[PDB]
Amino acid sequence: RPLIGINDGAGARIQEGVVSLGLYSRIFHNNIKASGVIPQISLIMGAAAGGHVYSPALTDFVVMVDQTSQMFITGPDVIKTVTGEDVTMEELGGAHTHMAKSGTAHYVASGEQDAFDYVRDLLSYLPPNNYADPP
Amino acid sequence: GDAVTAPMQGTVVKVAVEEGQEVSAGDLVVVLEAMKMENPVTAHKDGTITGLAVEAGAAITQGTVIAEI
Amino acid sequence: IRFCDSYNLPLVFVVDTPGAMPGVAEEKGGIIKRGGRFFNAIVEADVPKVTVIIRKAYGGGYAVMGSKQLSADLNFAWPTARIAVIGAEGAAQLLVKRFPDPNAPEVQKIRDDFIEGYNLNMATPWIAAERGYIDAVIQPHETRLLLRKSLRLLRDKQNGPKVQRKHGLLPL
Amino acid sequence: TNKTTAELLAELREKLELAKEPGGEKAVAKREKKGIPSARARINALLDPGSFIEIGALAKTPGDPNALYGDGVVTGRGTIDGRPVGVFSHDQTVFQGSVGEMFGRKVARLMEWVAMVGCPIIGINDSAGARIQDAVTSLAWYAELGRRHEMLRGLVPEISLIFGKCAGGAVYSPIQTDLLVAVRDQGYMFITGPDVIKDVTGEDVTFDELGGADEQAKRGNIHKVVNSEAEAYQYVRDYLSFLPSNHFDNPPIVNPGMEPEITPHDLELDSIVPDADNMAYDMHEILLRIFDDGDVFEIAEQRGPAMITAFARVDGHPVGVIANQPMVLSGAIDNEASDKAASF
Amino acid sequence: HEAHIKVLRGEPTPEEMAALMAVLASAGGGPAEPVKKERNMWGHPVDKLRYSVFSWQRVTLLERTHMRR
Amino acid sequence: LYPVAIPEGSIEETLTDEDLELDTLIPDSPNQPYDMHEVITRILDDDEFLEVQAGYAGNIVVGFGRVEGRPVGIVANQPTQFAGCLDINASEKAARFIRTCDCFNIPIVLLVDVPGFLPGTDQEYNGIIRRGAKLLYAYGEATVAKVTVITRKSYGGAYCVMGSKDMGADVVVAWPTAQIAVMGASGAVGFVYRQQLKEAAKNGEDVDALRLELQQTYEDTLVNPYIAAERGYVDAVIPPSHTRGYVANALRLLERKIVQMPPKKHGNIPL
Ligand SMILES: CCC/C=C/C=C/C/C=C/CCCCCCCCCC(=O)SCCNC(=O)CCNC(=O)[C@H](O)C(C)(C)COP(=O)(O)OP(=O)(O)OC[C@H]1O[C@@H](n2cnc3c(N)ncnc32)[C@H](O)[C@@H]1OP(=O)(O)O
Ligand SMILES: CCC(=O)SCCNC(=O)CCNC(=O)[C@H](O)C(C)(C)COP(=O)(O)OP(=O)(O)OC[C@H]1O[C@@H](n2cnc3c(N)ncnc32)[C@H](O)[C@@H]1OP(=O)(O)O
Ligand SMILES: *C(=O)CCCC[C@@H]1SC[C@@H]2NC(=O)N[C@@H]21
């Protein structure tokens, strides 16, 4: 059956140890096993940071919210420290950036209800799995 | 080309060469402290160190020319 | 269970058991191999497996009656469920094996205080729920429509990865 | 402020030598007062010299300051007679050998390893009760370990060595395996111990009457009973010498082509059967003559002794032999002879 | 033992009854011949998948999909 | 295969001096880089390494060699280039190499020394999210034998990408110098103690010395292989010289892997 992930999180929980990295590895591995088996859709509805970005990247469709949502691996403070570049979190990881430049987003919704309408439209074309007959 | 260039923004903690020194390919030319790594930057070809444009302690920016060779 | 698996009937477990029955006659009767066959059949079956726990689910009873660890798909408990390695009276007797003067006045007091604490804190749904060994604790009236929703989800379940081979051996 | 690479390697070597005896002298003392060998010494005695590679020697129960390395089990891989095997061995010096979280995860990792490589697995079991400080974790991990037999049953040969009181939930994993070998007066296997039987049901029963090795062999829960651990190890080596490493591969071929002519030992068979139909005889006098040599390796001798189930070799290829034993109960097929033959 | 249409409130006259039923009968759209459709497994999706040589789905997906009738 | 005269005995019994040279290879200061070819050529037979695509994305080294005559694909972080950070180009290079090996049953060995992903806005705008996930997909899909040797750093998302255990690394071993953590201690202390660094800043204390003290305490507590070995994410912590023995054992045993992936026409790797 299709899997919808709604993603909104500051990456690994730093007080928990490497265990967070083990669970991230297992989540990615399951997205890879499911890749080409079931429709995987990722909604991004806040700042997804660090580990939270590769799971959407491995899913089939990524839907973002125009300026409420962001994705980035490395935060602005680290980019400033290493490279000197001042960048806002919106300019670094905004939905417009990932549409127009990175090519990672498939839709930029005007709001959360628009994002849900696009996810329902997407699902309306897809079968539930790679062997069921389509609607 | 005829430029050793800084591969990333970093702080010069060593310059391993003298103006007019002959250097072989793979020779160390500078050390830049960047990303918490004392990165070596090396001569990409046999040549002579000329126009050297670094000194110790300076922060230098990416793409800065370090020496001609 | 093996027959139902062969004819693809989904399996619903309705647990309420203290586990295997103790006794020398049951030991001599083969209870280890028979229980091992029950454990084998539950894991072998590929059909959708859904479990509802009512009241007691102790030890091997919890495990064998379609636990999540033995490949049950969805696990629900009524709020009366009691999931533990052993029931309160058995844990109390296992403690009273130490300083074992059961004629004493106070031991029969601390027994009941221990059983009260154990039935409040240990033999409950809540540790299994907070650890995720069971997927929901439900109001009892929800059960019929919950089972419909669950088995409709599981209608197409494919079990795997499994290595195809002549057969799986079982305790015999 | 930062230790050198030499200091870090020296710390590693000290930590590994500590992790070889996690209980320390306080638990070594009690083990050696009981005279039993350590969980690693058992593995080293079973496996080929120096072949053992240990996996998860530095595992610990997560977030617990009290935890000891290994979590109560030694797990890894090696060879027997140069052929790969997985092995695990309970270590009663750490938390009594009780099943913890990392105990479970280590043995599960080993079972998944042997299922992926396709090689036999030997489990040296001596104690694996619930961990008194966190028993519902032991409840979960008994089932998490039990499930992974799904990967092994009928794919790779499984062996259990019963070197202690296998009690409670500890019995339900061994009983899935293909061969149980128990050490007499040392290995025991039972669900509910004498004390709980006594105070729930009133009966009196000793450990031998309840679940001693000889009793469980006659009841057919144990496939072999031996007088020492070394005899158990050799019995495992012999047993594995008749088998492929997995469902797919071939067995070893041992001494093919011997004695291609009719021998005196063949001609002895013309008169081996007694003249009168009421007589009886030991079937082994036939079995020792009709196969390539006397290496008729019997399994479950004591269970249903009216039936012989054994490995033998024909032209060097192993075969399973099912034979009646007229010497016992006139060779009638009893309940246990039937289920023994079906299982074999 | 059939499930009949029911009118729960009021009584229509025979003319109103005829109009109600006539419009509902007209609304009874469909194939005009509902029967079990012709089976044609050519190029069914389950034949397109890659199965490992030992994959259990060769039993529980591929074979059952072909053999089910 | 080539037939090889494989020695007999334990790994520690069968060490060559060329193996013992690994025990002193890693510099004492974690800011000093080293050439990863010094490891690669010592674990491979005859030093013989066929490097693939050597001139591109030099922050990762990939190529073929043999271990006891069995071909292997090495993939290895290169501390001398961009401090070994993963970037777009190294990710695509390693993803294509790993998938080329897995097509042709060549097992892969990762030598891991990665501080994380390379910072920069141009990495985001060129799609490091989309294109780094290629190396995740390729490694998670690969069903040949996959062995991971961790040699100093393995941090954050790059720990997951460089063949973590739950990505299905069949054997993971770590040298004593390994450092496995969510992030560098400088950032971790700047997060987990941001409370106490407020209290100290309000008190006007030497917050710089307090950061240094907390960072030391964090580094000594958590930035080591042992927390991952305790979780069982590292199968063994080993003297560096054992590396060749552990690899050779793994690749001999995993010559056929009985592993499978759910039926599909093909996957949907990010492009
Ligand atoms: C296509 C192919 C497909 C095929 C696939 C199919 C395959 C799949 C198969 C799937 C298989 C599924 C597997 C599911 C597993 C079963 C579920 C497990 C859970 C349980 O079902 S249930 C756990 C176990 N657990 C209890 O029950 C506690 C209740 N218990 C009892 O039921 C018994 O009674 C007993 C015997 C167990 C307890 O035994 P004991 O009470 O432990 O023993 P004791 O007192 O004699 O001695 C020790 C104690 O005393 C102290 N002590 C005494 N003497 C000495 C001395 N000399 N020196 C030092 N200390 C000493 C010491 O401290 C210690 O303490 P502690 O008490 O151990 O903590
Ligand atoms: C794979 C490994 C990795 O990716 S390491 C990831 C490390 N990430 C960070 O350091 C994030 C720090 N900044 C952030 O808060 C987040 O990046 C973003 C997404 C920007 C959220 O910012 P904002 O909405 O302003 O939240 P905030 O800074 O006010 O923090 C609110 C509460 O969230 C918590 N939080 C956040 N991230 C983590 C984390 N990774 N681990 C643990 N806790 C985290 C903060 O501690 C804070 O808690 P509290 O509400 O102050 O009690
Ligand atoms: C050191 O002072 C902190 C900044 C450097 C952080 C390093 S850079 C390369 C890795 N990628 C990342 O996001 N953090 C790591």
PDB file of C-alpha atoms in Angstrom, chain D residues 29-217:
ATOM      1  CA  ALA D  29      35.960 -17.889  41.432  1.00  0.00           C
ATOM      2  CA  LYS D  30      32.417 -19.298  41.524  1.00  0.00           C
ATOM      3  CA  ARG D  31      32.683 -20.726  38.000  1.00  0.00           C
ATOM      4  CA  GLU D  32      35.924 -22.548  38.795  1.00  0.00           C
ATOM      5  CA  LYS D  33      34.541 -23.701  42.142  1.00  0.00           C
ATOM      6  CA  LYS D  34      31.747 -25.276  40.104  1.00  0.00           C
ATOM      7  CA  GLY D  35      34.491 -26.713  37.877  1.00  0.00           C
ATOM      8  CA  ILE D  36      32.726 -25.816  34.614  1.00  0.00           C
ATOM      9  CA  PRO D  37      34.788 -24.278  31.777  1.00  0.00           C
ATOM     10  CA  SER D  38      34.171 -20.778  30.497  1.00  0.00           C
ATOM     11  CA  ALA D  39      31.862 -19.944  27.602  1.00  0.00           C
ATOM     12  CA  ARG D  40      34.884 -19.094  25.448  1.00  0.00           C
ATOM     13  CA  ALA D  41      36.877 -22.162  26.487  1.00  0.00           C
ATOM     14  CA  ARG D  42      33.931 -24.308  25.362  1.00  0.00           C
ATOM     15  CA  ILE D  43      33.894 -22.593  21.960  1.00  0.00           C
ATOM     16  CA  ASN D  44      37.674 -22.966  21.673  1.00  0.00           C
ATOM     17  CA  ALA D  45      37.405 -26.677  22.491  1.00  0.00           C
ATOM     18  CA  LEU D  46      34.619 -27.231  19.958  1.00  0.00           C
ATOM     19  CA  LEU D  47      36.035 -25.242  17.038  1.00  0.00           C
ATOM     20  CA  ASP D  48      39.234 -25.862  15.108  1.00  0.00           C
ATOM     21  CA  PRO D  49      42.290 -24.270  16.784  1.00  0.00           C
ATOM     22  CA  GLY D  50      42.344 -20.481  16.444  1.00  0.00           C
ATOM     23  CA  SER D  51      39.489 -20.414  13.931  1.00  0.00           C
ATOM     24  CA  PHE D  52      37.084 -18.466  16.173  1.00  0.00           C
ATOM     25  CA  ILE D  53      36.216 -14.870  15.259  1.00  0.00           C
ATOM     26  CA  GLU D  54      34.086 -13.224  17.962  1.00  0.00           C
ATOM     27  CA  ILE D  55      31.301 -10.769  17.089  1.00  0.00           C
ATOM     28  CA  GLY D  56      30.093  -8.187  19.604  1.00  0.00           C
ATOM     29  CA  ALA D  57      32.636  -8.858  22.352  1.00  0.00           C
ATOM     30  CA  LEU D  58      32.204  -5.253  23.557  1.00  0.00           C
ATOM     31  CA  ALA D  59      28.397  -5.122  23.431  1.00  0.00           C
ATOM     32  CA  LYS D  60      26.677  -3.834  26.576  1.00  0.00           C
ATOM     33  CA  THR D  61      23.113  -3.308  27.730  1.00  0.00           C
ATOM     34  CA  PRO D  62      22.356   0.251  26.564  1.00  0.00           C
ATOM     35  CA  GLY D  63      22.209   3.092  29.052  1.00  0.00           C
ATOM     36  CA  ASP D  64      22.932   0.906  32.091  1.00  0.00           C
ATOM     37  CA  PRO D  65      25.986   1.777  34.237  1.00  0.00           C
ATOM     38  CA  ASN D  66      25.851  -1.748  35.709  1.00  0.00           C
ATOM     39  CA  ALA D  67      26.200  -3.530  32.364  1.00  0.00           C
ATOM     40  CA  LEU D  68      29.042  -5.966  31.694  1.00  0.00           C
ATOM     41  CA  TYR D  69      30.602  -6.657  28.308  1.00  0.00           C
ATOM     42  CA  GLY D  70      29.135  -9.441  26.197  1.00  0.00           C
ATOM     43  CA  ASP D  71      25.726  -9.205  27.928  1.00  0.00           C
ATOM     44  CA  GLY D  72      25.901 -12.910  28.810  1.00  0.00           C
ATOM     45  CA  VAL D  73      26.636 -14.696  25.524  1.00  0.00           C
ATOM     46  CA  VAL D  74      29.674 -15.374  23.347  1.00  0.00           C
ATOM     47  CA  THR D  75      28.858 -15.324  19.634  1.00  0.00           C
ATOM     48  CA  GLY D  76      30.882 -15.750  16.497  1.00  0.00           C
ATOM     49  CA  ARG D  77      32.042 -17.914  13.642  1.00  0.00           C
ATOM     50  CA  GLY D  78      34.705 -20.477  12.921  1.00  0.00           C
ATOM     51  CA  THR D  79      35.306 -23.828  11.290  1.00  0.00           C
ATOM     52  CA  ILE D  80      34.817 -27.464  12.220  1.00  0.00           C
ATOM     53  CA  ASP D  81      36.995 -29.791  10.136  1.00  0.00           C
ATOM     54  CA  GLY D  82      37.701 -26.776   7.943  1.00  0.00           C
ATOM     55  CA  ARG D  83      34.029 -26.153   7.154  1.00  0.00           C
ATOM     56  CA  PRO D  84      32.334 -22.899   8.255  1.00  0.00           C
ATOM     57  CA  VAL D  85      30.024 -22.896  11.256  1.00  0.00           C
ATOM     58  CA  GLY D  86      28.354 -20.289  13.404  1.00  0.00           C
ATOM     59  CA  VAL D  87      28.485 -20.804  17.158  1.00  0.00           C
ATOM     60  CA  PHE D  88      27.075 -19.168  20.272  1.00  0.00           C
ATOM     61  CA  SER D  89      27.644 -20.083  23.916  1.00  0.00           C
ATOM     62  CA  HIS D  90      25.811 -18.830  27.005  1.00  0.00           C
ATOM     63  CA  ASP D  91      28.055 -17.293  29.691  1.00  0.00           C
ATOM     64  CA  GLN D  92      26.604 -17.794  33.188  1.00  0.00           C
ATOM     65  CA  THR D  93      29.172 -15.406  34.720  1.00  0.00           C
ATOM     66  CA  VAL D  94      27.341 -12.305  33.408  1.00  0.00           C
ATOM     67  CA  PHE D  95      23.849 -11.722  34.834  1.00  0.00           C
ATOM     68  CA  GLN D  96      23.556 -15.483  35.393  1.00  0.00           C
ATOM     69  CA  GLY D  97      23.527 -15.858  31.617  1.00  0.00           C
ATOM     70  CA  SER D  98      20.038 -14.347  31.553  1.00  0.00           C
ATOM     71  CA  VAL D  99      18.641 -13.251  28.188  1.00  0.00           C
ATOM     72  CA  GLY D 100      19.043  -9.494  27.820  1.00  0.00           C
ATOM     73  CA  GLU D 101      18.548  -7.077  24.954  1.00  0.00           C
ATOM     74  CA  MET D 102      22.095  -7.291  23.612  1.00  0.00           C
ATOM     75  CA  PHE D 103      22.152 -11.043  24.243  1.00  0.00           C
ATOM     76  CA  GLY D 104      19.102 -11.272  21.998  1.00  0.00           C
ATOM     77  CA  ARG D 105      20.487  -8.913  19.360  1.00  0.00           C
ATOM     78  CA  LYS D 106      23.823 -10.759  19.276  1.00  0.00           C
ATOM     79  CA  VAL D 107      22.292 -14.205  18.835  1.00  0.00           C
ATOM     80  CA  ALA D 108      19.800 -12.831  16.287  1.00  0.00           C
ATOM     81  CA  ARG D 109      22.705 -11.295  14.356  1.00  0.00           C
ATOM     82  CA  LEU D 110      24.447 -14.675  14.403  1.00  0.00           C
ATOM     83  CA  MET D 111      21.341 -16.528  13.202  1.00  0.00           C
ATOM     84  CA  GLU D 112      20.926 -14.011  10.369  1.00  0.00           C
ATOM     85  CA  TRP D 113      24.616 -14.457   9.556  1.00  0.00           C
ATOM     86  CA  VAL D 114      24.449 -18.236   9.322  1.00  0.00           C
ATOM     87  CA  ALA D 115      21.200 -18.000   7.341  1.00  0.00           C
ATOM     88  CA  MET D 116      22.927 -15.625   4.898  1.00  0.00           C
ATOM     89  CA  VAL D 117      26.178 -17.601   4.583  1.00  0.00           C
ATOM     90  CA  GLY D 118      24.405 -20.975   4.586  1.00  0.00           C
ATOM     91  CA  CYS D 119      26.370 -22.881   7.224  1.00  0.00           C
ATOM     92  CA  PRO D 120      25.521 -24.967  10.311  1.00  0.00           C
ATOM     93  CA  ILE D 121      24.913 -23.284  13.661  1.00  0.00           C
ATOM     94  CA  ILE D 122      25.830 -24.737  17.074  1.00  0.00           C
ATOM     95  CA  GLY D 123      24.308 -23.323  20.261  1.00  0.00           C
ATOM     96  CA  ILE D 124      26.025 -24.211  23.556  1.00  0.00           C
ATOM     97  CA  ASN D 125      23.213 -23.678  26.061  1.00  0.00           C
ATOM     98  CA  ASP D 126      23.669 -23.837  29.825  1.00  0.00           C
ATOM     99  CA  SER D 127      21.545 -21.061  31.328  1.00  0.00           C
ATOM    100  CA  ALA D 128      19.242 -18.469  29.799  1.00  0.00           C
ATOM    101  CA  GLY D 129      16.612 -17.526  32.355  1.00  0.00           C
ATOM    102  CA  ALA D 130      14.769 -14.237  32.409  1.00  0.00           C
ATOM    103  CA  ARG D 131      16.814 -11.248  33.562  1.00  0.00           C
ATOM    104  CA  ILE D 132      15.361 -10.580  37.007  1.00  0.00           C
ATOM    105  CA  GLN D 133      15.934  -6.817  36.795  1.00  0.00           C
ATOM    106  CA  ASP D 134      14.137  -6.529  33.426  1.00  0.00           C
ATOM    107  CA  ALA D 135      12.252  -9.752  32.805  1.00  0.00           C
ATOM    108  CA  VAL D 136       9.777  -8.388  30.226  1.00  0.00           C
ATOM    109  CA  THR D 137      12.765  -7.636  28.001  1.00  0.00           C
ATOM    110  CA  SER D 138      13.744 -11.291  28.279  1.00  0.00           C
ATOM    111  CA  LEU D 139      10.132 -12.101  27.391  1.00  0.00           C
ATOM    112  CA  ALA D 140      10.431 -10.008  24.233  1.00  0.00           C
ATOM    113  CA  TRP D 141      13.846 -11.350  23.204  1.00  0.00           C
ATOM    114  CA  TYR D 142      12.974 -15.010  23.734  1.00  0.00           C
ATOM    115  CA  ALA D 143      10.397 -14.450  20.995  1.00  0.00           C
ATOM    116  CA  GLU D 144      12.702 -12.313  18.847  1.00  0.00           C
ATOM    117  CA  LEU D 145      15.215 -15.190  18.952  1.00  0.00           C
ATOM    118  CA  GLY D 146      12.548 -17.831  18.383  1.00  0.00           C
ATOM    119  CA  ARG D 147      11.325 -16.085  15.241  1.00  0.00           C
ATOM    120  CA  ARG D 148      14.653 -16.234  13.406  1.00  0.00           C
ATOM    121  CA  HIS D 149      14.532 -20.024  13.280  1.00  0.00           C
ATOM    122  CA  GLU D 150      12.200 -19.206  10.382  1.00  0.00           C
ATOM    123  CA  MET D 151      15.416 -18.463   8.477  1.00  0.00           C
ATOM    124  CA  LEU D 152      17.125 -21.712   9.533  1.00  0.00           C
ATOM    125  CA  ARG D 153      14.572 -24.540   9.774  1.00  0.00           C
ATOM    126  CA  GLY D 154      15.317 -26.833   6.836  1.00  0.00           C
ATOM    127  CA  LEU D 155      17.879 -24.451   5.333  1.00  0.00           C
ATOM    128  CA  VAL D 156      20.917 -25.069   7.586  1.00  0.00           C
ATOM    129  CA  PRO D 157      21.705 -27.797  10.174  1.00  0.00           C
ATOM    130  CA  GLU D 158      21.098 -26.648  13.753  1.00  0.00           C
ATOM    131  CA  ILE D 159      22.639 -28.192  16.864  1.00  0.00           C
ATOM    132  CA  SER D 160      22.043 -27.557  20.571  1.00  0.00           C
ATOM    133  CA  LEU D 161      24.467 -28.694  23.278  1.00  0.00           C
ATOM    134  CA  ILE D 162      22.732 -28.958  26.669  1.00  0.00           C
ATOM    135  CA  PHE D 163      25.418 -28.315  29.289  1.00  0.00           C
ATOM    136  CA  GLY D 164      23.185 -27.059  32.095  1.00  0.00           C
ATOM    137  CA  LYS D 165      19.679 -26.568  33.451  1.00  0.00           C
ATOM    138  CA  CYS D 166      17.778 -25.431  30.348  1.00  0.00           C
ATOM    139  CA  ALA D 167      14.637 -24.266  32.111  1.00  0.00           C
ATOM    140  CA  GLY D 168      11.532 -22.247  31.416  1.00  0.00           C
ATOM    141  CA  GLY D 169      11.564 -20.310  28.154  1.00  0.00           C
ATOM    142  CA  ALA D 170      15.088 -21.567  27.490  1.00  0.00           C
ATOM    143  CA  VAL D 171      13.701 -24.900  26.244  1.00  0.00           C
ATOM    144  CA  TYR D 172      11.677 -23.579  23.295  1.00  0.00           C
ATOM    145  CA  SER D 173      14.654 -22.477  21.182  1.00  0.00           C
ATOM    146  CA  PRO D 174      16.726 -25.675  21.575  1.00  0.00           C
ATOM    147  CA  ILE D 175      13.699 -27.855  20.794  1.00  0.00           C
ATOM    148  CA  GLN D 176      13.461 -26.277  17.334  1.00  0.00           C
ATOM    149  CA  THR D 177      16.991 -27.417  16.439  1.00  0.00           C
ATOM    150  CA  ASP D 178      17.827 -30.588  14.519  1.00  0.00           C
ATOM    151  CA  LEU D 179      20.152 -32.206  17.079  1.00  0.00           C
ATOM    152  CA  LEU D 180      20.160 -31.967  20.876  1.00  0.00           C
ATOM    153  CA  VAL D 181      23.139 -33.474  22.708  1.00  0.00           C
ATOM    154  CA  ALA D 182      23.022 -33.370  26.511  1.00  0.00           C
ATOM    155  CA  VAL D 183      25.700 -34.042  29.118  1.00  0.00           C
ATOM    156  CA  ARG D 184      24.591 -36.628  31.685  1.00  0.00           C
ATOM    157  CA  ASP D 185      23.991 -35.363  35.240  1.00  0.00           C
ATOM    158  CA  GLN D 186      24.755 -31.860  33.931  1.00  0.00           C
ATOM    159  CA  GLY D 187      22.274 -31.130  31.150  1.00  0.00           C
ATOM    160  CA  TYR D 188      18.622 -30.853  32.179  1.00  0.00           C
ATOM    161  CA  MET D 189      15.635 -29.542  30.236  1.00  0.00           C
ATOM    162  CA  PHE D 190      12.254 -28.618  31.700  1.00  0.00           C
ATOM    163  CA  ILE D 191       9.612 -25.899  31.575  1.00  0.00           C
ATOM    164  CA  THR D 192       8.585 -25.681  35.245  1.00  0.00           C
ATOM    165  CA  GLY D 193      11.026 -26.488  38.021  1.00  0.00           C
ATOM    166  CA  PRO D 194      10.434 -28.817  40.964  1.00  0.00           C
ATOM    167  CA  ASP D 195       9.633 -26.009  43.421  1.00  0.00           C
ATOM    168  CA  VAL D 196       6.879 -24.476  41.296  1.00  0.00           C
ATOM    169  CA  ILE D 197       5.520 -27.934  40.518  1.00  0.00           C
ATOM    170  CA  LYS D 198       5.528 -28.741  44.235  1.00  0.00           C
ATOM    171  CA  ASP D 199       3.777 -25.611  45.458  1.00  0.00           C
ATOM    172  CA  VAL D 200       1.266 -25.405  42.579  1.00  0.00           C
ATOM    173  CA  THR D 201       0.428 -29.115  42.259  1.00  0.00           C
ATOM    174  CA  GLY D 202       1.810 -30.841  45.371  1.00  0.00           C
ATOM    175  CA  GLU D 203       3.836 -33.506  43.554  1.00  0.00           C
ATOM    176  CA  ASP D 204       7.367 -34.393  44.637  1.00  0.00           C
ATOM    177  CA  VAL D 205       9.892 -34.722  41.809  1.00  0.00           C
ATOM    178  CA  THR D 206      13.688 -34.615  41.526  1.00  0.00           C
ATOM    179  CA  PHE D 207      15.487 -32.949  38.622  1.00  0.00           C
ATOM    180  CA  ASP D 208      16.329 -36.375  37.171  1.00  0.00           C
ATOM    181  CA  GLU D 209      12.713 -37.552  37.274  1.00  0.00           C
ATOM    182  CA  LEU D 210      11.522 -34.205  35.897  1.00  0.00           C
ATOM    183  CA  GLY D 211      13.947 -33.556  33.050  1.00  0.00           C
ATOM    184  CA  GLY D 212      17.245 -35.365  33.380  1.00  0.00           C
ATOM    185  CA  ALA D 213      19.197 -36.167  30.246  1.00  0.00           C
ATOM    186  CA  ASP D 214      18.386 -39.891  30.253  1.00  0.00           C
ATOM    187  CA  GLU D 215      14.690 -39.249  30.903  1.00  0.00           C
ATOM    188  CA  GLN D 216      14.439 -36.642  28.136  1.00  0.00           C
ATOM    189  CA  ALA D 217      16.301 -39.005  25.799  1.00  0.00           C
TER     190      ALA D 217
END
